Amino acid sequence: PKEACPYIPIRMVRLDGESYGRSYIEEYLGDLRSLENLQEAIVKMSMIS
């Protein structure tokens, strides 16, 4: 049945007209990349020191 299909596709963040959902992490992936850049530089500075 249309309402009782055992195969359930779940979308975390659903956008209109999209077959798949967006992840929650990708909304903050920009800050994660920027923090990644800072954290790499901070650790690598300590390795020079």
Binding site: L29, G30, D31, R33, S34, N37
Partner: protein, 196 residues
Amino acid sequence: MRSYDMNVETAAELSAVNDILASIGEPPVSTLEGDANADAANARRILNKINRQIQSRGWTFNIEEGITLLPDVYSNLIVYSDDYLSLMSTSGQSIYVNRGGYVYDRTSQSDRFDSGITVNIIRLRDYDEMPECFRYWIVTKASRQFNNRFFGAPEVEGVLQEEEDEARRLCMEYEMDYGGYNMLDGDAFTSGLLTR
């Protein structure tokens, strides 16, 4: 080493030599052709010397990046001319030296190349090909060295010392304006760090 005195004089080279002659108070000459003028001949030699020295320092306008130097197909030799004021690698540590007037790969210990090499090169240019500010600095530095060597006037030494510093300053202003360097998006490392 390129002969400075074996080609036809340009108007700018005539102007430069007379400016150098003026530094010690020599009257201008009409031509750079041989008139047994020791002062003018000395000035041209110092003009050529300073022209090679300032160009070899390296600037955005005269540093050629990504230049291919082609080898001879039958000898596999790339000539290292004396007009190559600086020859570097495009990135990292440089590997090419001068050995017998030909390019030598010091890491591979070979002077034989099957194909052209890509190098960051400074090639000697005519004083006529210099930017106006750089021409002024070359003349100012040549005039200062000319007075030091052939007149030695201590009052002239002090003023030309200040003139060269001002002349070099304005060449640094030209190089920054020409370069248009950015530490955010024109930076090799930081521009990658700016991507979100």
